Design an enzyme around this catalytic site. Structure first.
Site, PDB file in Angstrom:
ATOM      1  N   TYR A  98       0.824  -1.200   0.000  1.00 15.76           N
ATOM      2  CA  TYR A  98       0.000   0.000   0.000  1.00 15.76           C
ATOM      3  C   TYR A  98       0.871   1.270   0.000  1.00 15.76           C
ATOM      4  O   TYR A  98       1.837   1.366   0.780  1.00 15.76           O
ATOM      5  CB  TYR A  98      -0.959  -0.016   1.219  1.00 15.76           C
ATOM      6  CG  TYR A  98      -2.164   0.975   1.180  1.00 15.76           C
ATOM      7  CD1 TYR A  98      -3.292   0.681   0.429  1.00 15.76           C
ATOM      8  CD2 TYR A  98      -2.206   2.125   1.979  1.00 15.76           C
ATOM      9  CE1 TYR A  98      -4.351   1.512   0.392  1.00 15.76           C
ATOM     10  CE2 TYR A  98      -3.305   2.960   1.949  1.00 15.76           C
ATOM     11  CZ  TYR A  98      -4.368   2.627   1.148  1.00 15.76           C
ATOM     12  OH  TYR A  98      -5.461   3.377   1.042  1.00 15.76           O
ATOM     13  N   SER A 137       1.279  -8.026   2.197  1.00 19.64           N
ATOM     14  CA  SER A 137       0.256  -7.054   2.645  1.00 19.64           C
ATOM     15  C   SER A 137      -0.722  -6.780   1.508  1.00 19.64           C
ATOM     16  O   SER A 137      -1.367  -7.712   1.042  1.00 19.64           O
ATOM     17  CB  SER A 137       0.932  -5.781   3.188  1.00 19.64           C
ATOM     18  OG  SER A 137       0.000  -4.873   3.793  1.00 19.64           O
ATOM     19  N   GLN A 138      -0.844  -5.538   1.039  1.00 15.50           N
ATOM     20  CA  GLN A 138      -1.681  -5.277  -0.164  1.00 15.50           C
ATOM     21  C   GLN A 138      -1.267  -6.212  -1.314  1.00 15.50           C
ATOM     22  O   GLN A 138      -2.118  -6.765  -1.997  1.00 15.50           O
ATOM     23  CB  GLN A 138      -1.606  -3.817  -0.642  1.00 15.50           C
ATOM     24  CG  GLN A 138      -2.436  -3.520  -1.928  1.00 15.50           C
ATOM     25  CD  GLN A 138      -2.310  -2.095  -2.420  1.00 15.50           C
ATOM     26  OE1 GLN A 138      -3.261  -1.310  -2.339  1.00 15.50           O
ATOM     27  NE2 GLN A 138      -1.126  -1.750  -2.908  1.00 15.50           N
ATOM     28  N   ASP A 148       1.203  -8.910  14.444  1.00 13.81           N
ATOM     29  CA  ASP A 148       0.910  -7.999  13.350  1.00 13.81           C
ATOM     30  C   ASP A 148      -0.398  -7.269  13.633  1.00 13.81           C
ATOM     31  O   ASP A 148      -1.447  -7.885  13.665  1.00 13.81           O
ATOM     32  CB  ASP A 148       0.799  -8.795  12.075  1.00 13.81           C
ATOM     33  CG  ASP A 148       0.784  -7.921  10.846  1.00 13.81           C
ATOM     34  OD1 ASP A 148       0.382  -6.747  10.957  1.00 13.81           O
ATOM     35  OD2 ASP A 148       1.133  -8.347   9.718  1.00 13.81           O
ATOM     36  N   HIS A 170       4.291  -6.629  11.562  1.00 15.11           N
ATOM     37  CA  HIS A 170       3.955  -6.660  10.126  1.00 15.11           C
ATOM     38  C   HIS A 170       5.142  -6.930   9.205  1.00 15.11           C
ATOM     39  O   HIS A 170       4.966  -7.211   8.019  1.00 15.11           O
ATOM     40  CB  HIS A 170       3.260  -5.356   9.750  1.00 15.11           C
ATOM     41  CG  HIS A 170       2.554  -5.410   8.431  1.00 15.11           C
ATOM     42  ND1 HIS A 170       1.677  -6.425   8.095  1.00 15.11           N
ATOM     43  CD2 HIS A 170       2.592  -4.572   7.372  1.00 15.11           C
ATOM     44  CE1 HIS A 170       1.221  -6.205   6.874  1.00 15.11           C
ATOM     45  NE2 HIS A 170       1.752  -5.084   6.418  1.00 15.11           N
TER      46      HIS A 170
END
Lengths: 322, 322, 322, 322, 322, 322
Positions: D91, D187-188, D273, D302
């Site tokens: 992101y 993640s994204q 996370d 994360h």
């Protein structure tokens, strides 16, 4: 990221003072009025687990005869007349237990600990109420804006008067050597002690560490920490009351007392102190009109010199009283 | 990152209530003692820039005859008798200016805005002092622990009594329709209104948003936000006073009033509210003994439903008074 | 911590202005292009619970014929032609509900509330979409860097054009007195209004509180708060694009518009405002070319004068229009 | 400070899935509509300082023929057909520079790095715009709420379609072994890969690290971190739009894609996370319908397994492909 | 709200240097003592998944024959003698995995990665212990105050000597072109490299990014971030040791090495860097005695130029080595 | 908004213990190895400003003959044999000045204050170095992970041995009543004292406040405060070392010592303590095998009972020793 004026500037920092024409008259009349009530000092010996010290439960009449608590700790020593430290307490503190105050006794000084009216709920318990001058005006939470719309109703009028009377109470104890009565405090305790250095006739030396209640106009411009932020927050809301607030505060500002104080003093300052900024402390030190020294701690915040400063204080007083 | 009980549990949450055997007698005596002083309601019409509303400066006798300020805003409308909203104010607020309260008048309701004794210095200015029951005991900064060692001295004894008497003062205004008097508030205002919903004989409906002063023992265990943290901080210091503090607060707990309140109510709650946690709000809602509804805002914090909730309130009252 | 230039320096602060040679031409051509689409103002009376005010759902053509929402609130008064406030909205806000804008109507002003394209999702809901100039370039989350690589694609080109056209739409409502149309806003709304004070031929007075979108280069060097930080964060990544970014922003900078604005204005500023720093506000005020006053709030942050300032505005306009 | 379900519960966590009856139809129609435009892949060899790798500037047609940027990095090796990783980006990231993506090439894999439409401004630059489905509705700043009131207009419809087409583009490069095309991200990037694992017919294996865009309803309840908080902040304002928001999100939820995905996968998760909580990662992993493993990093946030995870990926693929 | 001196002042910033009269003698003796131990470089070829690079497990003798770990990464290229970057690592990092250092090899440079004694536990693992000069004196947690009461015992005496010897080890590898040996690092790595640029006879160019270990007296005054705050916190406690602390630090200050360094250098600096403030970076750059350039990133914090700076470094070295 | 298990669960909390089969053998050998070096206790009388107390500068042999500093403070009293408190010190502290330790002497007890090896730089100064077992492995900053890859090299092996020897050194002083030797500490001091209650044959009673070094696996899962976070941060990086780290820690875990300790003990616990969570303290208290009491402070954080707890300790010891 905290920084005040550079040290070379701080040492020369002498901002214009602001006080009302009746500053002295206000305090004369305040003290006279409270002196009309008998001091009535009470020292009740206590059953205590302490072995090296005699502990007394203290009561005395402060502002307008109001009864203020304290402790008296007397170190068990051969000497008949002992030197004495009158100890004032930091913001949100109170007299706590006798054992919270063992330093000065251990150093051979009688210690008179003054309880602080209405506080005693933040970091150390207290036992003494406040008594307002009638109605308790709208205020921000805390003691800084309590009665701030008029010097006669202002919280620290009562505290300061109790503090002056505490020295009289200490002096009334038979084992106290009246030639060696010291007034001491840090932060709020230091601002109280500064007032007392100007107002008391009995105090012989001042220990003033990282003093609070100094140079209010600047303090409020510099930091957003508590407790100075109580004032700022008041002013954020009562936008019509700025002139009045600072007029009131002028009668309680340690800088204006320092200018009147004539007894020997040892100050301390932390150059990273963002509770009691260095410029406020130096304003007061620089205007202080008695013989004076300052210990400067460049890397310390509001803890100042801590235990190093305690040693400097013992040495300072030994030398002064020889 | 804050979370209370899951919603299905909240809807069933009925914690064991704790109150003293003299809860009702305490309040009966309190109200009777203040009723011995004449209400003496004053409505002074003001020179105002407002055009759609008539503004009045209010004075009335609250706790023990003490004079409490307010505003009365009357919308300029043909109808002779109008419905009325008695508005209580959140923590650190005060009556501010008449124009700060234009919602209810714009919706066709007379609005009586009660100023809050001793506050009015945090987010909106106030004009009304507190008057303590004698000495002001040691306290943590703020209003939550002011006089907390005894219900007779406790701050909210005075505020709640003022608030009951405010409904009487509103009812005394000639254009007020006494069959349509509403008591309203959010947070502290909601806690106050909840008390009034049990103690007043004049109020006809309750609007209770994100209420504060509810389920104290749980509040203090769940959140470390202010103002509940004033109580926690007091207890951190006065470690011997836990039983007394919670005894005192039992007389002021919105859950204990809810159990006694009979009038129709609209409540609101934010499931992510960490000032007034959902479990404290639900404990009061669930014990509430009158006809009741609750609007639940799952993603909202202490702002609750904001303007959406204001609409719900307008609709709720329209239907009720039909 | 937060401190900008001292007040005495702020009052003389006139930094060198940067704008492109084609600033005026850019805006002339922008406005001319949008004026080729009919304004087609629509005012649809609504069924409302409001009693003192008539509410209308508004639509009008803004940037390139794009249809912008709003509210028109008309106070129910005898007077035939009323003065009017065109209200612009803060960042992440939207037109919300009619009842969110009761102040000006209550003061006897028609109020035209302009919805903000693409925003309406932070603190108050909105109903108006944005329409980009084709592709939506890489951007930091938000509206500050939306289309920032070219003035022609830049988000606030569309907003400022809508805002100019909003005045025209308000002027088209029959009960509006065209000699008394005010443009008003705080923060983003203040930045929008300042652009409109330069670009509109219809506006008669400006109320500009704690303006945003002023002196971008300085803003970004002073504070790391949002929304100015959206720009910094974009520049942190797109390290090749600094000159282009500040060239784009120059066309939208409230300081450049101030220098062209000729109508009477009341500004406000909070000296502890770290969202819209005092130096950026004063740069715009000091360059403002119309008759002007500023209210200075030394202890306030971004809230500025709040309700005190609202009173100053009612008084300022009454005097101006008498 | 953060804790999700205990690991033993996470391993069993299979929350009830919610999707609309037309989930598959929506994606069939979406992909078909975009496949009417020619892929038109462009790979332009670049003058580069890189010595061990051939770098290509990539363009291909993604959602509805819109032109998406990328990098193709080819390690200089004897082997004629090489395995390939299609890399999606986190992101507020973008394709940055070719040298930002040297891991997979160094491990002997061709790497196709897909630029992310409209982002590229937070931690790594990008070059690819977004192109809305007409009006850009009111939104909270960022990409999570862009077009969220309708799945047809929702930002991730476009990103996921680009991402399916990126695999097609990679496969079109002559040196790519089509039997060894991997889709990867964190993640994204992981959320995108997960969608592609269900929707692409060309992908042969999935690397899915600390996946974002999973189990939205839970994410939003659990954490207040960005970027999930963009959704919560939108819902705090648009209080009437809860059902529509989650309806829309159901079409983009990684858990719903995981249930349809049949290719072999290596997941990772950080049990501390708080950006992509473990329970959302495990819900996806647990529903994942192909052959699967997960690496569990109990003490990581994360960052997950970091360089340890990279080694696990290389090993996993070597074993899978041999 | 972070800011150092304005750029035009930073460019002229040349604070008075402080060093002891035996600075050179201290380093001459230190190096001579460690040179009595054989370098005994070991390069063990590893089984690796890497395909474009040959990886070696490195051991060499650093401070007083103490065995230091490293990686050697050799890009697989035709050229016989390759240029070489000796890479030093940031605070709390270590040599990690060979695949953590693929940049320079990908750019055609052999890369010698030096593990950092005693660290390797914060953001990337390490394998090399520290070996104190006997007793490990009272210290604040970390490496900054380890042995700080005496230059001979100070931690960075050992690190810097390891770093000088790492260049010698690199030069001993047969494929290394000794005319093109570069020393490089960011933050702690940059401070280490700056020492080596003064003390090594083998280094040919310096890459020095956002350098740490520079201008300590100022650093500690300006910022309260770690790791500089380790020093401040040590001084807050050891209030008697200020003079000794800064005397010790003077032998390790990047500004004092810069004044002696004669090789060509590329510096970088982030003007919003509050870990390594710009004034400390510029003091070092301004005193740097070799041919030099600086890349200035006005909007970046400690990330500096990131991938943009990496590109500048490749171009800088290509130009210098042609 | 922190919380551990409910008090009723805490009172029954007895987690499964984990220790290696050679726990006792490890400590038997450790102690026997250090006992081969003579204790050689030195008590040097000091010139001091203290009047109620005699101060001695202490040196004794701790771990493997290594020389540890201390203070001995003897109150000036008639009694020939006095009871004794051996005081251990909290994390980042040291022996400071003699006047820092006046409580117990004032209560009639000799006080032996043990300096803490290698610390003494955070809140109170220290004078004693650490001596590692050869190389100092990669570690996270501080003492918690120093030598953690092996119990033989682990920092607390040395501290706990010193501490066992400190009791022997106090017992060697002629005025000490060996039937009334107390071991005392809070937090780290409490963890040390707990180890000593198990290992020393000379200690007669334990005062253990808010103990640290207890139930490590749980602590690290519950809180992200320091100093437990030093371990977590280590594990975040050295992802391959989890089993080794916790195996090492099992040898030093206060819960394992508590199970072996037979002397009478007074514990304290703060239910809001997020440095030493209540579940870790109760796990130790509940496994404690001697006669025991716990004072529970429900509203306190890591300060625990403060001065209230000091009173409880004095009363507890008086009763015990009658």
């Amino acid at each position: 990221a905290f920084f005040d004026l550079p040290l070379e500037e701080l040492k020369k920092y002498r901002p214009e003072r602001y006080e009302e024409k009746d500053f002295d008259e206000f305090w004369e009349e305040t003290l006279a009025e409270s002196e009309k009530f008998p001091l009535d000092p009470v020292f009740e010996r206590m059953e205590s687990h302490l072995k090296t010290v005699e502990a007394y439960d203290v009561t005395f009449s402060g502002y307008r005869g109001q009864r203020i608590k304290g402790w008296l700790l007397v170190p068990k020593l051969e000497e008949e007349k002992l030197p004495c430290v009158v100890q004032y307490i930091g913001y949100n503190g109170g007299r706590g237990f006798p054992h919270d105050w063992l330093f000065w006794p251990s150093m051979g000084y009688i210690c008179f600990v003054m309880d602080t009216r209405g506080q005693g709920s933040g970091w150390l318990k207290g036992d003494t109420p406040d008594y307002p001058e009638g109605p308790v005006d709208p205020q921000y939470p805390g003691f800084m804006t309590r009665g701030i719309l008029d010097p006669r109703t202002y919280y620290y009028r009562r505290v300061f008067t109790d503090a002056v009377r505490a020295v009289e109470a200490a002096a009334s104890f038979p084992q106290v050597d009246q030639e060696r009565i010291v007034i001491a405090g840090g932060s709020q305790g230091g601002g109280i002690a500064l007032a007392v250095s100007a107002l008391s006739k009995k105090a012989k030396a001042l220990l003033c560490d990282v003093p609070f209640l100094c140079h209010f106009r600047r303090a409020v411009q510099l930091v957003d920490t508590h407790p100075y932020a109580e004032i700022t927050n008041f002013l954020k809301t009562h936008r019509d009351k700025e002139e009045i607030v600072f007029r009131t505060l002028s009668y309680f500002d340690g800088v204006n007392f320092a200018a009147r104080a004539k007894i020997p003093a040892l100050f301390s300052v932390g150059l990273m102190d963002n509770i009691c900024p260095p410029s406020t402390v130096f304003a007061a030190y620089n205007y202080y009109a008695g013989p004076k020294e300052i210990r400067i701690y460049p890397y310390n915040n509001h803890e100042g010199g801590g235990s190093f400063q305690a040693v400097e204080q013992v040495k300072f007083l030994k030398k002064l009283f020889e």
